[PDB]
Symmetry: D3
């Protein structure tokens, strides 16, 4: 089990969208992970060892217990049977209580496809008769993180104390952000802007197709 798993199209994308929240969950004692669907080979600069080192350093900064990769083709993500079944099999193994996956609305077709894959795989992982190994597992909560298209957030997660971890894990991708340095500062401004609506220094936006079960007097 993971308390929280982020499914990302390639390495750096889970960090970009969810780093603050992942760092917070770790601080609160949760076991966290990122599953990357591809190795980002159509956008990566650097040797296998160099890209691997950035992932290890980002994972360290955020305090992930789990980091894995499905090795699907970069630029070839698609909601097709083979990818659906392999993600669903990973979900039964990982048993995540909460999953974050990319929001469908995006300029990058891999994000849209990851989004659809997570939906279909969550459903499949839960089916008694799905052609998969192991016990059926039903993800309790699936939320989506925005990428490069505007969105109307369903909720935000306060991450004020975790902003420097968010930023350091993204900047760990030195071959990528040294989206670039301007991309990073834009996503930091997103967090500052959204958080200020709710009276906090920084917050990370998420979308849910369902209204959340919220306790209106609970702490931020």
């Amino acid at each position: 089990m993971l308390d929280l798993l982020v499914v990302a199209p390639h390495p750096d994308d889970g960090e970009l969208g969810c780093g603050g929240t992942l760092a917070r969950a770790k601080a609160e004692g949760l076991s966290t992970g990122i599953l990357d669907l591809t190795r980002g080979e159509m956008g990566s600069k650097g040797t296998p060892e160099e890209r691997e080192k950035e992932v290890a350093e980002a994972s360290r900064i955020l305090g992930l217990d789990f980091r894995g990769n499905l090795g699907f083709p970069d630029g070839g993500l698609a909601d097709v049977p083979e990818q659906r079944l392999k993600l669903a099999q990973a979900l039964r193994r990982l048993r995540p209580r909460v999953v974050f996956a990319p929001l469908e609305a995006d300029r990058h077709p891999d994000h849209t496809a990851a989004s659809r894959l997570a939906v279909a795989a969550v459903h499949l992982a839960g089916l008694r008769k799905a052609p998969l190994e192991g016990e059926p597992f039903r993800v309790e909560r699936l939320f989506f993180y925005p990428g490069n298209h505007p969105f109307a957030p369903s909720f935000l997660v306060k991450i004020s104390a975790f902003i420097d971890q968010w930023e350091a894990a993204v900047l760990a991708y030195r071959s990528q952000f040294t989206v670039g340095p301007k991309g990073v500062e834009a996503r930091k401004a997103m967090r500052r802007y959204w958080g200020n609506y709710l009276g906090v220094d920084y917050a990370e936006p998420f979308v849910s197709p369902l209204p959340v079960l919220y306790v209106p007097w609970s702490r931020a």
Copy 2:
């Protein structure tokens, strides 16, 4: 302070909209209230005398720390200075951490006016220089409960353990029972919304702002 106050246009409306959530807050040990803006004269198909007993019975069922009325005219709620100022004064007196007010979209213009009134009053209550008595107070959270029009909820509050209190408090208005099929339908709303999220009953609310949520937190 109250931990939670429901502002309602006429008695029975706060219960109708938020009774399950009010009962849950009370069970969790919070201080709760309903402030009614009118006495509901233009609809009270009971006497003023018996209506008084209904309100007390409903308040007891929900375990309200506070029940009050501002005495504005039924059918005449409006976002005008007089009403804004008396509501802002009450908010300063009650110091509610969270307020629920009716959703603007409705067939009943009092609901719509109560909505606007709550917004404007929350604002005025927090202004140092406002023409009001006491210290300025800033309501932390303002959320809206749907009435008789469709809505897209921002969040739901799980109330499965409190559905019977919600229903008993509404039914406390014996003289009222828009209502017998009305109550049925509002219980069906709670069953319907709650099932999306895998719970027996839940009450829907709307926020103009995304809520600050902790996605691994308990329901």
Copy 3:
């Protein structure tokens, strides 16, 4: 011709979404049907004979003239050429004046795919040069019924006198609802809740991408 055809991803799903309206159309003398795209084999419990018997009993309760199945793979519905063409061929044969198909917004990828299949097949069935047998046929009205995601209905159909048929045809799937019993009572509450907005005991919601041609003084 059918006056009304419901296209469903698997048996029980057309009943769950449209049973009241189907029972009403029958009462009004229309010839009705359900076309199931798959046999529901990845979710079914029971022998071939047992599942077949539930379908026959549900069909009886609703008074369907037509019941058929395309035998596509359960969990494998997709808007791909082979499925598109086979549904389109069924539509030319059936000649439905009105078709109901699942709404795209759903946790179950088969519903979303059925939705897209119905759209594409309606278009194909209408084409002179489509590689299909028989006379081109243009479905006059295509509406969508909600599944398990929230929706904003375009219209409702009053079904107060048909609620017990709706419920009995769903409960005919004894291996399934004995979604479960709680699922059924939730969909019954949907109907009660939606109907009460419009002053009726029960009503079934539908979505149309087009505004409907409505007569504002006509009877409910």
Copy 4:
């Protein structure tokens, strides 16, 4: 009773928005009317004398059973008790089964106010205890017709056979002809919306509630 009443802010507005539908209702044998809330003084680029003839000509073309005016101030429509109460009184006098009122979203604040007025008046007219004369009456259906702002229609009414009456009734306002290109554009609206649904012309309306529709019924 009327079967159908259009509430309009100034004369020509009801025709502009709903003339095809009014003519169809009449052809199907229904009793129809327009109630104008103002005389349109602040825009009447004709005389009050000639405007009277235009209104009568337009009413005749559409076959209205009832034409009236409430005499509220042009440019001063507002959802205030005085106006609410006089409109609610007229609704009780006319007992319309279906009312059409302007859509709220508009550049002209009278349209917006007429919208709110209709909502509040429908409500008041149905209240036993309202300060009004006669029996309480509950309008069955309230729908809204778009003005000069974009809208997402809830439904369309097929008016292909009635397009010429719609156009003749609008053109009846000779002194008016915002308008010559205005009329052209509103006829193009009807052509455009109607084509989505495979008909020559249709008039769009908005409902806050999904309509009770019979999906195999005739257009």
Copy 5:
């Protein structure tokens, strides 16, 4: 005429919302102004004397051709005839080709009222028969600037070269600095929205109508 006028509920609000765009207009040689509807008495945590200097400093930074105030009551903005008519009169005096006004959706009821006021006043100012002095004037474009509530922008104005003027003009309100983190957040808004469109900073606006755009034109 002005080429561009920003109508703001209290001083600092026009700058907060539209300062980058105002500075750009000025750099391109347009005539610009801010008309404040109130003096912001109910919030001015400086003196009236020092507030006067702040407004002048902010106006100078942005290069405004016109700065004025209508003296309406802070916290009492309302879409009522008195206020409508005085605003419509000012629009006739200023003849602005483009007006910016606050977006309706807000926690502060003055923003909401200023929005409605601008709509109604634009309309009245253009009416031959309106009870106003001077020639009728028709504002060509009316757009809305967001305040403290979320919004979906219709368009953005690239202001990368003007971000420092925007910030200096807001900071000119020394006595004010809702604000220090407020300013930071509004600069972050501009960074965030601007990045969607590949520019350093941009200011968002809302139009109820699609804009007339030339899709190969320069930013």
Copy 6:
């Protein structure tokens, strides 16, 4: 480079959606083009020469510098690797500053698929490591034109002086509009209706997922 390229599912569809704007851009001295994804063979009447002649005449009327076809199957458009890569390769060759592609919301599945293809191809064309020939090229602006589903336009383009060219290029498809004559007059009424909201005789609606960079005082 083209200043403006319209990507259309079949010949006549770019003209129907964008003709006015294309004619305007030409008048203003821009180099314009239409890339048709298919040859419209499942909807065309007439010989290869006849259909070819209509395209040449429409292209003439609008003043296109470029007219091309990718030869994908009519009724078989899909966001699949082969179609994605071939459109992306065409975009790198053409180097369009501004591209218009069909809006996703449509009854015709080819429009929806063209829409998704343009998005994915714009992304691919811009990638250093995409398996394509030639210099990476990043389309600056991608907008969408409505087809047969309602829409909420993001902007309109004033085309009052170009309405007769728009209409003549559509009517050049004599085998098609002699959608038919009624279809044409409906799209002309769309332009008249939308333009009147903004005080112009005719305007063509477009959608953008991003707010546009607009100069609020600029000329229409």
